[PDB]
Amino acid sequence: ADSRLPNFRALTPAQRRDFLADACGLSDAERALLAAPGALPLALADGMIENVFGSFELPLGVAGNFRVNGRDVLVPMAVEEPSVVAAASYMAKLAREDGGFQTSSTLPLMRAQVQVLGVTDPHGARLAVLQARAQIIERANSRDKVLIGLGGGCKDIEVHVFPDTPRGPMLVVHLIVDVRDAMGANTVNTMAESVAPLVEKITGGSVRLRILSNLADLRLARARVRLTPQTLATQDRSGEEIIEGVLDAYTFAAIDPYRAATHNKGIMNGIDPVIVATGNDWRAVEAGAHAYASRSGSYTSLTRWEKDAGGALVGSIELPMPVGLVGGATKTHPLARLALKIMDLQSAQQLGEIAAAVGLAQNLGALRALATEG
């Protein structure tokens, strides 16, 4: 795998398509799918959403130079905004000097909420539910033998109590579910329905909402990058001066929600187009990201930018990354399947790690540009 895109600025879209097809070993059918419009015929689109009367195209670009955990990866991006793809590619190029991005993730754990009303002893009922955790987990896992055979399934539960609300006390059971390579919404929603009668029997209450949480803070992707001063040096500015400017811009985002919103928007300029191009749900990724950014009690930066003891710039990101390689549009849309092949994805976790790296690079591109503007 080689993610370098020599002279791509000067090539036509057809020439870029042919280069990508050669670099990724795309089949003749896959090349033809890209060479004509309408890779998603209306008959297919008609089965995806309601009241279909057409299709709507986003430009599809490729960000170059990315290397993640030692592996080059080409990154498709479906987006309408200028400068985004070029900035991601340029920051990835600089990241290559330190060996690229380094990433990790948690297990692919999604939360399903089971909201219980009518329980007047919710703290005591919480203990009864926790004592019965094995029975609840077994009930959650009793229908999806395929997921369990892959090593997924419900792994744990939590119980949260809201003893005083305008609607009375609420007891909320969270099922913690390993969803493997799925985004997980339908999987965990079905388990929440499955456990509802047992939860009602234990608590004596009435189950209302049975629904995933998009605050997917048990399904985190992490990415780190390090750039020395010499890597960041330009004709006009020392790398040291650029590093100090990035830190100035980062601290501004850390302390001021008015800046943090724009700073994090820039991250999502990198992440969302990868989500879209792979057929994933961009609203879910946006909600998890921005809700996680508020976890401390103030809306703040999702990234951290620092200087290590030797003076190099170090960037880091950690954020929920609920994405899948199966199900939804990722299965039905022929170009989403092609995007997965271009990226050579082995797991949904890997897709999330790559997306986090792209968001981190995008953020660096914005901070480096804004801090070096004369």
Ligand X SMILES: C[C@@](O)(CCO)CC(=O)[O-]
Ligand Y SMILES: OC[C@H]1O[C@@](CO)(O[C@H]2O[C@H](CO)[C@@H](O)[C@H](O)[C@H]2O)[C@@H](O)[C@@H]1O
Tell me the closest approach of the beta carbon of residue 13 to ligand X, in angstroms: 23
Tell me the closest approach of the beta carbon of residue 58 to a second copy, in angstroms: 5
Q: Is 281 annotated as a binding residue?
A: yes
Q: CA-to-CA distance for 136 and 240, rounded, in angstroms?
A: 56
Query: Is 34 strand, coil or helix?
Result: helix
Which residues inside 293-352 make contact with ligand Y, applying CB under 6 A?
A: 347, 349-350
What residue has token string 């795998």? 1
Please tell me whether residue 262 binds ligand Y under the rule CB under 6 A.
no
CB count, 10 Å around CB of 12?
A: 8
Q: Residue 297 binds what, of ligand X, ligand Y, a second copy, none (CB under 5 to 8 Å, by partner type)?
A: a second copy
Q: CA-to-CA distance for 181 and 215, rounded, in angstroms?
A: 18
Chain position whose Cβ is nearest to ligand X: 266
CB count, 10 Å around CB of 230?
A: 11
Which residues inside 167-226 make contact with ligand Y, applying CB under 6 A?
A: 226
265, 304, 306, 334: residue in contact with ligand X (rule CB under 6 A): 265
Q: Residue 261 binds what, of ligand X, ligand Y, a second copy, none (CB under 5 to 8 Å, by partner type)?
A: a second copy
24, 161, 211, 261: residue in contact with ligand X (rule CB under 6 A): 211
Q: Is 344 annotated as a binding residue?
A: no
106, 142, 262, 332: residue in contact with ligand X (rule CB under 6 A): 262
The smaller minimum CB distance to a second copy, of residues 133 and 307, is found at 307
Q: Is 184 annotated as a binding residue?
A: yes
Tell me the closest approach of the beta carbon of residue 259 to ligand X, in angstroms: 8
| Residues with Cβ within 8 Å of residue 67, at least 6 apart in sequence | 3, 73, 92, 95, 96, 99, 100, 101
Tell me the closest approach of the beta carbon of residue 306 to ligand Y, in angstroms: 12
Q: Is 183 annotated as a binding residue?
A: yes
Query: What is the strand order of the sheet 206-212 is part of?
Result: 153-162, 170-178, 109-117, 206-212
Please tell me whether residue 111 binds ligand X under the rule CB under 6 A.
no
Q: Residue 59 binds what, of ligand Y, a second copy, ligand X, none (CB under 5 to 8 Å, by partner type)?
A: a second copy
The smaller minimum CB distance to ligand Y, of residues 67 and 333, is found at 67
Q: Is 328 annotated as a binding residue?
A: yes
The smaller minimum CB distance to ligand X, of residues 164 and 373, is found at 373
Please tell me whether residue 353 binds ligand Y under the rule CB under 6 A.
yes
Closest CA to 349 of 103, 87, 145: 103
- Tell me which H or E stretch contains 68: strand 67-68
Tokens coding 112: 């399903």
65, 105, 141, 203: residue in contact with ligand Y (rule CB under 6 A): 105
Q: Is residue 213 a contact partner of residue 113, using CB atoms and an 8 Å limit?
A: yes
AA letter at 115: Q
Q: Is 359 annotated as a binding residue?
A: no
Q: CA-to-CA distance for 68 and 71, rounded, in angstroms?
A: 5
What residue has token string 């592996």? 71
Q: Is residue 305 a contact partner of residue 367, using CB atoms and an 8 Å limit?
A: yes
Q: CA-to-CA distance for 302 and 316, rounded, in angstroms?
A: 9
Q: Which residues of this protein are in contact with ligand Y, per CB under 6 A? A: 69, 98-99, 102-105, 226, 347, 349-350, 353
Site of interaction with ligand X (CB under 6 A): 81, 211, 262-263, 265-266, 269, 366, 370
Annotated binding site for NAD(+): 144, 181, 183-184, 186-187, 214, 281, 328
